[PDB]
C-alpha cells in the first residue's frame, strides 16, 4: 500500500544552502494502480525536471530503510550516485553515528544532493540541519528556520527539534513543533 499522507505532500522543497534538495520518496510504476496520474512521482519525473533546468544531482540519499518504493536503478542509470542510509528506527531521531555517516558521505560531493525519507520532513530535515551546523558553520537556529521555509512546515516532530538544540545550541531554546497545515490529515478516514 502507498504510504499515508503522501498523495498531498509536495514532491520537493526549495534547495537548502544551495546544496541539498529535500524530497518525499518517489514511488515507481509498481504503484500506478493506487496513484492517479496527477499525483505520480516516478524517479523519471525527478531526473526529467533536473534535465530541463540543466542541473545535475550528484547523489541521492535514501533515508527510508526500504526498497519497496522504487527501483534504485532508475536513479543510477542517470549517473546519479544512490545510497540507502539506514537510520535508527522506533521513531527515534537519527543517532550521532547516523549523522556522522551522512556527513562523511555528503562531504565527498555545482550539483545538488537529493535527500528523502518517506515524506521529506523529519529525518530529511534533521540530517540536512546537522550537516549545515557541523560542516558549513551555520547556527542551528538558522538551519531549522531555513529548512522550515524551504520545505514547509519543516521538521514537525518536537523531539527532533529538541535533540538538534541539545546537540548544537541550547535545549531550553528549542522551538515547539509548528502547527500543521490542513492538507496533512485529508486522508485520515
Ligand atoms: C507534513 As503532514 C504532518
Ligand atoms: Mg521501469
UniProtKB/Swiss-Prot annotation:
<protein>
    <recommendedName>
        <fullName>mRNA-capping enzyme</fullName>
    </recommendedName>
</protein>
<comment type="similarity">
    <text>In the C-terminal section; belongs to the eukaryotic GTase family.</text>
</comment>
<comment type="function">
    <text>Bifunctional mRNA-capping enzyme exhibiting RNA 5'-triphosphate monophosphatase activity in the N-terminal part and mRNA guanylyltransferase activity in the C-terminal part. Catalyzes the first two steps of cap formation: by removing the gamma-phosphate from the 5'-triphosphate end of nascent mRNA to yield a diphosphate end, and by transferring the GMP moiety of GTP to the 5'-diphosphate terminus of RNA via a covalent enzyme-GMP reaction intermediate.</text>
</comment>
<comment type="subunit">
    <text>Interacts with SUPT5H and RNMT. Interacts with POLR2A (via C-terminus); this enhances guanylyltransferase activity. Binds (via GTase domain) to the elongating phosphorylated form of RNA polymerase II; can form direct interactions with the phosphorylated POLR2A C-terminal domain and indirect interactions via bound RNA.</text>
</comment>
<feature type="domain" description="Tyrosine-protein phosphatase">
    <location>
        <begin position="21"/>
        <end position="174"/>
    </location>
</feature>
<comment type="similarity">
    <text>In the N-terminal section; belongs to the non-receptor class of the protein-tyrosine phosphatase family.</text>
</comment>
<feature type="active site" description="Phosphocysteine intermediate">
    <location>
        <position position="117"/>
    </location>
</feature>
<feature type="region of interest" description="TPase">
    <location>
        <begin position="1"/>
        <end position="189"/>
    </location>
</feature>
Amino acid at each position: 500500500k502507498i504510504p499515508p499522507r503522501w498523495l498531498n505532500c509536495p514532491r520537493r522543497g526549495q534547495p537548502v544552502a544551495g546544496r541539498f534538495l529535500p524530497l518525499k520518496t518517489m514511488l515507481g510504476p509498481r504503484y500506478d494502480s493506487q496513484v492517479a496520474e496527477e499525483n505520480r512521482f516516478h524517479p523519471s519525473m525527478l531526473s526529467n525536471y533536473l534535465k530541463s533546468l540543466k542541473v545535475k544531482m550528484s547523489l541521492l540519499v535514501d533515508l527510508t530503510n526500504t526498497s519497496r518504493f522504487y527501483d534504485r536503478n532508475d536513479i543510477e542509470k542517470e549517473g546519479i550516485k544512490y545510497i540507502k542510509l539506514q537510520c535508527k528506527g522506533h521513531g527515534e531521531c537519527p543517532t550521532t553515528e547516523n549523522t556522522e555517516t551522512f556527513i562523511r558521505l555528503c562531504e565527498r560531493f555545482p550539483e545538488l544532493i537529493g535527500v528523502h525519507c518517506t515524506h521529506g520532513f523529519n529525518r530529511t530535515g534533521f540530517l540536512i540541519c546537522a550537516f549545515l551546523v557541523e560542516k558549513m558553520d551555520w547556527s542551528i537556529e538558522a538551519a531549522v528556520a531555513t529548512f522550515a521555509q524551504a520545505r514547509p512546515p519543516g521538521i514537525y516532530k518536537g523531539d527532533y527539534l529538541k535533540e538538534l538544540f541539545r546537540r548544537y545550541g541550547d535545549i531550553e531554546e528549542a522551538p515547539p513543533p509548528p502547527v500543521l497545515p490542513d492538507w496533512c490529515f485529508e486522508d485520515e478516514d
